[PDB]
Amino acid sequence: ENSLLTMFRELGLPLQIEQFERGKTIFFPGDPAERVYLLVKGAVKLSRVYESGEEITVALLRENSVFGVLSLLTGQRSDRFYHAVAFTPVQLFSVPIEFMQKALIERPELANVMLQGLSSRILQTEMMIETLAHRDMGSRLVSFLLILCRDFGIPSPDGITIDLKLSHQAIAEAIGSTRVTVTRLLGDLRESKLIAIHKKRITVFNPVALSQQFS
Amino acid sequence: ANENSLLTMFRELGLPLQIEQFERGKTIFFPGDPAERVYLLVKGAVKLSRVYESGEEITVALLRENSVFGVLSLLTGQRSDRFYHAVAFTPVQLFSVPIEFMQKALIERPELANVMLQGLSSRILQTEMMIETLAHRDMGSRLVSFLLILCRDFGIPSPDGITIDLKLSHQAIAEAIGSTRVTVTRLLGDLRESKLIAIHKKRITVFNPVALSQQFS
Ligand SMILES: O=C(O)CCC(=O)C(=O)O
Ligand SMILES: O=C(O)CCC(=O)C(=O)O
């Protein structure tokens, strides 16, 4: 998160927020990749959709993330191949690519803000490769929950509460598992008093302690 | 592509900038080193991994030619420390630049941010393709999907399909697909018996890679 906000704000009279209700699509596979986006409030899910209807989550984007990054690849005018959806209610800015290109020229300083933003995305995607590299599905779940604690967490007496409504199917789609398995594993974590769930919001106790097993 | 442009830009980031050689298996940066440089991989493959206290390494990226990496330096500079291990997976040729020399070249050569932004966008997309590979629930499909990425990244034409132009130990494969070595040995054995790949001195050839990728639609 940073003053990506300030600079996106001034790319327009001012650039206007676009709102998306929970579950609405920001872009569809097959759409032209002609815009870059700054997520301002909420979380955006990027997924791969297969012919069977099955959907796999490739990114759960946090506030102040740059995305739609395919659009920066020129000279290809190609099409979106992921589906971007508002995972919660969402506020974002969106900019046609030509505008971006030009703003970078007439203010060199803002190159540096974008490079930092894309660097941060690379690192966050690599953290999700680590989560998925685990063979114990439990460790995989715990690792994913710690990333969410960091990305979407708010303080609690007990620990950190993930400020997101999480369905078990949504967790399954993000950690390469199934609803049934996720339910069993969340159940085990609850019995052991490592987490608690209230209204589909997972609170994890002692996330710093719990993250030790991940050397 | 942006590849040509990254090369030129980096090459002309002089006192003209000199290629550095790394022998196979040599470390480019260790966890705990200060994050003071950005890198451009020119020839070869660089393995990025996480190292746990047991000494076990997990692969987080097998970087292909013309990749920008060391990207943590673009946030924090020397201020923060590396937390991944970068290793020359083959013999490697690369350019590297102190972070300050980068930032300065960007202000002086405005349009050059573009080329860097393309490079980093490309890294995001490749890492996401690796999340897809790893999302697969059965190890077999994980393996095949990985091998197809490698065909694209490091493949050369063979008269049967594509040869992945890298030596791939069973251990190395296991560290990349979240499996055990034993599982990889058996799966590579199954792919050979089904006449889907051939292996010679650790170089894997996959027959008809386009047809095989259709199963992943
Ligand atoms: O990670 C991202 O920024 C979204 C991927 C993308 O740009 C696209 O699908 O067009
Ligand atoms: O993904 C990369 O470019 C390498 C990650 C990095 O910059 C670092 O670990 O310092």
CATH node for A122-215: 1.10.10.10
**Per the structure block, which two tokens stand in for A100?**
């971006």
Query: d(Cα B20, Cα B95) in Å, to the nearest integer?
Result: 6
State how far the alpha carbon of B75 is from the alpha carbons of A2, A127, B86, B98, in Å.
11, 16, 18, 13
Nearest atom within ligand 1 for CA of residue A69: 7
Q: How far is the CA of B72 from the centre of ligand 1 (A)?
A: 20
Phi–psi pair at B59, nearest 5 degrees: -85, 130
B71 CB within 8 Å of a chain A CB = yes
Query: d(Cα A161, Cα B73) in Å, to the nearest integer?
Result: 31
B97 CB within 8 Å of a chain A CB = no
Architecture of domain B124-217: Orthogonal Bundle (1.10)
Contact between chains at A176 and B75 (C-beta distance less than 8 A):
no
Contact between chains at B60 and A105 (C-beta distance less than 8 A):
no
- Residues of A whose CB is below 8 A from B135: 48, 56-58, 132, 176
Residue A72 counted as an annotated binding residue? yes
Write the DSSP string, chain B.
Answer: -HHHHHHHHHHT---PPPPEEE-TT-EEE-TTSB--EEEEEEES-EEEEEE-TTS-EEEEEEEPTT-EE-TTHHHHGGGSB--SEEEESSSEEEEEEEHHHHHHHHHHSTTHHHHHHHHHHHHHHHHHHHHHHHH-SSHHHHHHHHHHHHHHHHEEE-SSEEEE-S---HHHHHHHHT--HHHHHHHHHHHHHTTSEEEETTEEEEESHHHHHHTT-
Q: How far is the CA of B125 from the centre of ligand 1 (A)?
A: 7
Q: Using CB atoms, pick whichever of A69, A82, A178 lies closest to residue B121.
A: A69
Residue B99 counted as an annotated binding residue? yes
State how far the alpha carbon of A59 is from the alpha carbons of A6, A43, B215, in Å.
24, 10, 23
CATH fold match for the domains A1-121 and A122-215: no
From the candidate CATH numbers 2.60.120.10, 2.70.98.60, 2.40.30.110, 2.40.10.10, the one assigned to the domain spanning A1-121: 2.60.120.10
Q: What is the dihedral of CA A149, A153, A157, A159, to 10 degrees?
A: 0
Residues within a 6 A CB radius of ligand 1: A 33, 46, 59, 67-70, 80-82; B 124
Q: Which of A76, A112, A118, A180 to mutate to test the interface with B (most CBs of B within 10 A)?
A: A118
- Strand extents, DSSP E, chain A: 18-20, 25-27, 35-41, 44-49, 55-61, 66-67, 83-86, 90-96, 153-155, 159-162, 195-198, 201-205
Residue nearest to atom 4 of ligand 1 (CA): A68
Experimental technique, in short, is X-ray
- Mutational test site, ligand 1, from A4, A58, A67, max ligand atoms within 8 Å of CB: A67
A109 CB within 8 Å of a chain B CB = yes
B19 CB within 8 Å of a chain A CB = no
- Residues of B whose CB is below 8 A from A114: 113, 117
Break chain A into its structural domains and give their ranges. 1-121, 122-215
Say whether A37 sits in a helix, a strand or coil. Answer: strand
Residues 6 or more apart from A190 whose CB is under 8 A from it?
A196, A197
Within 10 angstroms of residue B207's Cβ, the number of other Cβ atoms is 15
Architecture of domain B1-123: Sandwich (2.60)
Residue A40 counted as an annotated binding residue? yes
